[PDB]
RNA sequence: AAGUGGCGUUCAGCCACACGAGAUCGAGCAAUAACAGGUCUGUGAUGCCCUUAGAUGUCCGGGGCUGCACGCGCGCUACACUGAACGGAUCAGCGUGUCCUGCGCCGACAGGUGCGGGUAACCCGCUGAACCCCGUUCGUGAUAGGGAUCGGGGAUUGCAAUUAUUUCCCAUGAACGAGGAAUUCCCAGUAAGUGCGGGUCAUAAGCUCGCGUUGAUUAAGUCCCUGCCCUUUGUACACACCG
C-alpha cells in the first residue's frame, strides 16, 4: 500500500469497499461518535467505510494490532472544558465490529500470536487499490 | 539553479547600501524553504546571516497561539509569496526586501530622565521585519481575511510607500518624533 | 452577511470577479457582501467552467486567478 | 428563490440563514448532536440553509423531534429519559423544557431535599466551593 | 559493497543504508518525496537537488528512523543520506570525489554532515520548565 | 547451558566479580558468552527537603542505581548472583 | 538637506543611563573627512553603514 | 582560550576566525557567620507545663475541615479563521507495574466478561501521545468561539458519595471581543505551545516533580530603578537602630 499517498489511499479503498456493497455497516451508523472524546458524529455519512479502508491499511503496515491496538490508533485529544486537554483512545465497539467487517470479506483473519492480521486475499485487493492511485496520478 | 522552487533568489537587488549587508538573500543564503534552524541566535551578530524569509517566518509566531508552530508560518510565508506574484508580477522576493527597506526607521528617540538618536542597520532590519508581522497579525485577528492576504498586503504596501501599511505609519511615527526631539 | 446569491449579487459575480487579480473565498466575500461559505462554493463552480483558474489550494488558502 | 429568513418552529425563530443542523439547536431541548441525527433519520441533504426546507420537510423534522423513540432513536440519546413520574423516555422541546426544569425544582422544595434547598437560597448545588467564586 | 551511517536530531536516528545500484532512495520502504510532511519536503531533497541525480543513481538508500518528532526526523534523513553518500565514495569511489561531494553539502548547511548536540534541558524545581521560574 | 545474572549497585566491584567469572571459567575450556550489560535502572525520589512546609520549595533528588549484566556459560559484598539453566 | 551614508569605523563605548544607545565615531564614505561621532541605538559593530537623516550636529 | 588575527602594563585576559562532536552545559556539593527564620502536627529527638479515666489517652458512629454579602495569592480555560469542529496521515522520551495491561466477545459511551502475559531491555510495548501535517465543511457574527452554571439518566471505586468521589450520555449555553493602576518569569533546543510519566492514589490532577515534542523575538549591555556586597566616613550604638 506503500508508494502511494496514504490519504488518497483510504479515499479510493473506501470507494472501492462501497462500490463493493458487501460491507456490514452496523445499524447504529447514524448514532454514534467515534470517540468520547468527539463533540460531534462524523460529517461524512459514509463514514463505516471511510474507517474501514484505513483499518485494512494499518493491519497492512503492522499486522497482529486487534481492537485495542485501533482503539489507541484512532485516539486523540480530549478536551476536558475548564480543565487541560488529555490522550482519549477511541471507541472500541466500532473498531471492534469494524475489525469483523473486514473479515466477512476474507481480508482480515484471527492473528495466531496476537490479535487480528491481514489475509494474502486482503494483500492483494490493497495492491490493486494502490496500483490505480497510482496510475491516476 | 537556487529557488524557493518557483520563486527564483537572483535578480534581487538591494538599494540601501546599509541594509545590503544585512539581509540575506542572494548567493549564499538561497535555500528551498525559509525553515534551516542554524542556531542564529548563539552570537551576537549571527542573526545577520540569516535569511530574511526565514527571519520573516519566525516573526509570524508571535502570540501565545501560535509559538512552536513554524510549519505553519512557513505555510503562511508560502501562500503569502503567491499572493504577492499574483497581486504583482514582481518577484517576490524583491518585494520582501524592498518593504524592509522603507519599513527601517533611520532615526529613534531615547528617554532621558527625550533626545534622538542613530539606529544600527541590524535593529532597522530587526524593527522593520517586527513591524511588518505585528500589522498583518493585527489585520486578521477578527475578520475574513486570511493571514496570507494580509501579509500579502502589508507587504506590497511596504514596498510602495503607500502609507496604509501598519509599518509604514509606524515608521514615519517614529522619524517624526526623532524629527522634533532632535 | 449574505447566504445566498440575488439576481444582482450572481450575475456581479460572473462578470467582473474573472476579471480580479487574486482570487479567493475571502476577497470576494468583503466586496460582494456574501458570507465566506458561499463565497467558497461558488469559487469551485467557476473552477469547473473555466472562467477562473487555481494558483495553489490548501485547507485555509485556495487562491485563485484569471485565465 | 421562495428562501425563508426567519422560520417559525415550535414558537421559536430559527433562523433560516444558518445550516439546516444548527439552526434547528436555537430550540431548547435540542443541541448539535439531537440535531444532526434528528436529521439524519428524515433524509435530508445537511448541506442547505434551514430556509432552503420545503414546508412538508420542515414538518417532518418537527414530527422526529418531538417522537424520537418511534423513529428508531435509542433512549440513551434523550435528555429527559425516566421520568420520575411517569417513567416515559422523550425530548423536552422548548415549551417543556422550562417546565420541566421548573418542576422538578419544585419536587426538591416541597420534600425540603438538599438539593432543592440549594436552589431557593440561590447557591451552588454540586458540591462546589462558593467561598471565593460565584460572585455574581 | 555497501554502508551504514546514522544520522541524529534531538531524539531521531535516522540509518541509511547506502548500497550500489539504481537510484532507489527509501525511508521506512515509503520514498523520498512520500513522508507525510509535505512543508519540509524540499528539505529532504537537498541532498539530491545539490548533488544531482547522476551521483545518487548508482545506489540504493534505505533509511530507516525512529525517535524524535516529524520535524526531527526530516533534518536526521537528510543528514543520514547525505553522510551515506560520503562514506560511500570514501570507501569505494575516489577521495577527490569524497572533497567534490562534502564542499558541496558543508557549504550550502553544515547539518547535513554535522549533527548539532542541542538536546533539551532538565527541568528544575520552582518552575514550569529549564529557565522559567512560578 | 547455564545463565549467570549479576546485578550489583556499583560497576566497580560488579565488574571486578565479572571479569573473574569470564576469566575462572575460559581456563576450563568453557565457550562463554560475553557480558551483557543490560540498561541501567536509576531509582529516583525526588522529596521535599525540609521537615515542614515554610522550605522555599527546595527539592533533593535521590538515586539508586541498579546495573545489571548477564553471563551465559556452557564474590563481593553489594553483588546478586542468581545462575539458571 | 540630504540624507547623508556613513560608515562606522571605531565603536567608542555605551552611554544612556540604561546603555542603549552606542557612541560610535562615524566617518563619511564620499570622503575621508567629517569622522564625527554619532550615538546610534541597536547593535552595531566596525564596518556597520548608518544612514544619517541629519550629520550637522554631533551629539 | 590549543591554533590564527586583533585589542591589552603586548602581562592577566578579551574579541574575531580556522579546525572541530563543543570554543561559557545542567544539576549536585557548597566557607566564616547570622536569624529569636520554619518545624514539639515527621520521629519510641526532647525540657517544662497541662490533661490523665465523667480523659486532651483510645475506639466506634455522625458532622466539620467543601460551610459564603466580600478582599487577595498561585493556577487552568478562553475571548477564535495564526481558529472550533469532522475525517486522513504521521512522529517521542522519562518512567511505573503483583499491580501494569495485552487479545477474543458485550455495549452508543462509560462499563462488563472469559482467556492471557509480565516481579520485567523479555509482557503492556515498535509505548501508533498530543500539538503538528493533509482534506473537509463552518465565515465581523457572544457563532460550529467560550463549556461556566443546572436538569434527566447509565456505570465504576468502596463498608458507605447526600454537601453532586470520579466517569459517560443527552440537554442547559453564563461572564469573557487581549484586560485599569500595577506586577511576574525569562538569553537557546531557552521562552512559549503541546502531550506523556512519576509523586498523592480503594476512587484520583486544574497541583507538583520529571520527560520528550514543536520551537522563536530580543539582548552579548548598564547602574537608571529596585536589591545586596565592599571601601571610605560618622556614632553617646556593642542586648549592637527592633539600639
Not at chain 2, 508581522?133 to 503607500?162: M, P, W, Y
Not at chain 4, 443542523?21 to 430550540?27: D, E, H, L, P, W
Not at chain 5, 518525496?33 to 545506489?59: D, N
Not at chain 6, 569470564?22 to 581456563?27: F, L, S
Amino acid at each position: 500500500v506503500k508508494d502511494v499517498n496514504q490519504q488518497e489511499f483510504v479515499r479510493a479503498l473506501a470507494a472501492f469497499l462501497k462500490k463493493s456493497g458487501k460491507l456490514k455497516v452496523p445499524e447504529w451508523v447514524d448514532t454514534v461518535k467515534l470517540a468520547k472524546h468527539k463533540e460531534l458524529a462524523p460529517y461524512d455519512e459514509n463514514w463505516f467505510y471511510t474507517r474501514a479502508a484505513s483499518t485494512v491499511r494499518h493491519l497492512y503496515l503492522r499486522g497482529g494490532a486487534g481492537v485495542g491496538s485501533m482503539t489507541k490508533i484512532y485516539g486523540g485529544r480530549q478536551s476536558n472544558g475548564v480543565m487541560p486537554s488529555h490522550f482519549s483512545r477511541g471507541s472500541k465497539s466500532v473498531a471492534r465490529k469494524v475489525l469483523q467487517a473486514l473479515e466477512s470479506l476474507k481480508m482480515v483473519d484471527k492473528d495466531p500470536s496476537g490479535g487480528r492480521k491481514l489475509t494474502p486475499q486482503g494483500q492483494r485487493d490493497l495492491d490493486r487499490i494502490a496500483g490505480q492511485v497510482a496510475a491516476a496520478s | 539553479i537556487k529557488l524557493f522552487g518557483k520563486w527564483s533568489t537572483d535578480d534581487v537587488q538591494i538599494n540601501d547600501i546599509s541594509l545590503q549587508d544585512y539581509i540575506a538573500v542572494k548567493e549564499k543564503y538561497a535555500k528551498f524553504l525559509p525553515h534551516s534552524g542554524g542556531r542564529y541566535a548563539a552570537k551576537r551578530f549571527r542573526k545577520a546571516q540569516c535569511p530574511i524569509v526565514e527571519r520573516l517566518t519566525n516573526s509570524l509566531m508571535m502570540h501565545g497561539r501560535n509559538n512552536g508552530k513554524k510549519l505553519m508560518t512557513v505555510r503562511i510565508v508560502k501562500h503569502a509569496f503567491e499572493i504577492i506574484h499574483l497581486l504583482t508580477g514582481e518577484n517576490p522576493l524583491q518585494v520582501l526586501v524592498n518593504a524592509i527597506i522603507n519599513s527601517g526607521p533611520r532615526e529613534d528617540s531615547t528617554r532621558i530622565g527625550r533626545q534622538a538618536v542613530d539606529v544600527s542597520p541590524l535593529r532597522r532590519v530587526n524593527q522593520a521585519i517586527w513591524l511588518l508581522c505585528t500589522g498583518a497579525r493585527e489585520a486578521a485577528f477578527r475578520n475574513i481575511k486570511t493571514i496570507a492576504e494580509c501579509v500579502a498586503d502589508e507587504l506590497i504596501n511596504a514596498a510602495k510607500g503607500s502609507s496604509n501599511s501598519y509599518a509604514i505609519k509606524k515608521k514615519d511615527e517614529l522619524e517624526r518624533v526623532a524629527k522634533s526631539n532632535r | 452577511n449574505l447566504v445566498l446569491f440575488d439576481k444582482a449579487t450572481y450575475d456581479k459575480l460572473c462578470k467582473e470577479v474573472p476579471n480580479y487579480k487574486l482570487i479567493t473565498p475571502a476577497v470576494v466575500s468583503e466586496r460582494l457582501k456574501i458570507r465566506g461559505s458561499l463565497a467558497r462554493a461558488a469559487l469551485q463552480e467557476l473552477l469547473n467552467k473555466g472562467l477562473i483558474k487555481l494558483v495553489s489550494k490548501h485547507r485555509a488558502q485556495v487562491i485563485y486567478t484569471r485565465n | 428563490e421562495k428562501f425563508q429568513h426567519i422560520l417559525r418552529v415550535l414558537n421559536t425563530n430559527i433562523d433560516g440563514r444558518r445550516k439546516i443542523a444548527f439552526a434547528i439547536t436555537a430550540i431548547k431541548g435540542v443541541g448539535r448532536r439531537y440535531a444532526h441525527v434528528v436529521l439524519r433519520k428524515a433524509d435530508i441533504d445537511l448541506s442547505k440553509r434551514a430556509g432552503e426546507l420545503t414546508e412538508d420537510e420542515v414538518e417532518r423534522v418537527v414530527t422526529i423531534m418531538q417522537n424520537p423513540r418511534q423513529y428508531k432513536i435509542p433512549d440513551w440519546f434523550l435528555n429527559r429519559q425516566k421520568d420520575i413520574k411517569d417513567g416515559k423516555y422523550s425530548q423536552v422541546l422548548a415549551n417543556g423544557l422550562d417546565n420541566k426544569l421548573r418542576e422538578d425544582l419544585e419536587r426538591l422544595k416541597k420534600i425540603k431535599a438538599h438539593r432543592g434547598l440549594r436552589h431557593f437560597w440561590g447557591l451552588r448545588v454540586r458540591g462546589q466551593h462558593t467561598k471565593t467564586t460565584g460572585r455574581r | 559493497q555497501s554502508v551504514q551511517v546514522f544520522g541524529r536530531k534531538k531524539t531521531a536516528t535516522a540509518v541509511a543504508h547506502c548500497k550500489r545500484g539504481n537510484g532507489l532512495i527509501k525511508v521506512n520502504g515509503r520514498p523520498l518525496e512520500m513522508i507525510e510532511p509535505a512543508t519540509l519536503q524540499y528539505k529532504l531533497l537537498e541532498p539530491v537537488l545539490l548533488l544531482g541525480k547522476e551521483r545518487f543513481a548508482g545506489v540504493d538508500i534505505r533509511v530507516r528512523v525512529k525517535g524524535g518528532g516529524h520535524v526531527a526526523q526530516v533534518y536526521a534523513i537528510r543528514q543520514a543520506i547525505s553522510k551515506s553518500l560520503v562514506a560511500y565514495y570514501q570507501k569505494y569511489v575516489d577521495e577527490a570525489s569524497k572533497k567534490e561531494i562534502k564542499d558541496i553539502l558543508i557549504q550550502y548547511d553544515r547539518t547535513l554532515l554535522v549533527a548539532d548536540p542541542r538536546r533539551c534541558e532538565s527541568k528544575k524545581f520552582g518552575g514550569p520548565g529549564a529557565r522559567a521560574r512560578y | 547451558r547455564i545463565r549467570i545474572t549479576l546485578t550489583s549497585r556499583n560497576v566497580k566491584s560488579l565488574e571486578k566479580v565479572c571479569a573473574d567469572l569470564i576469566r575462572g571459567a575460559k581456563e576450563k575450556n568453557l565457550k562463554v558468552k560475553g557480558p551483557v550489560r543490560m540498561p541501567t535502572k536509576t531509582l529516583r525520589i525526588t522529596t521535599r527537603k525540609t521537615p515542614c512546609g515554610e522550605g522555599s520549595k527546595t527539592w533533593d533528588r535521590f538515586q539508586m542505581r541498579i546495573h545489571k549484566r548477564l553471563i551465559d556459560l556452557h564474590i563481593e559484598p553489594g553483588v546478586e548472583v542468581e545462575v539458571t539453566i | 538637506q540630504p540624507i547623508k551614508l556613513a560608515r562606522v569605523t571605531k565603536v567608542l563605548g555605551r552611554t544612556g543611563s540604561q546603555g542603549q544607545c552606542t557612541q560610535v565615531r562615524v566617518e563619511f564614505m564620499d570622503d575621508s573627512n567629517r569622522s564625527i561621532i554619532r550615538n546610534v541605538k541597536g547593535p552595531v559593530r566596525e564596518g556597520d553603514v548608518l544612514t544619517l537623516l541629519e550629520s550637522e550636529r554631533e551629539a
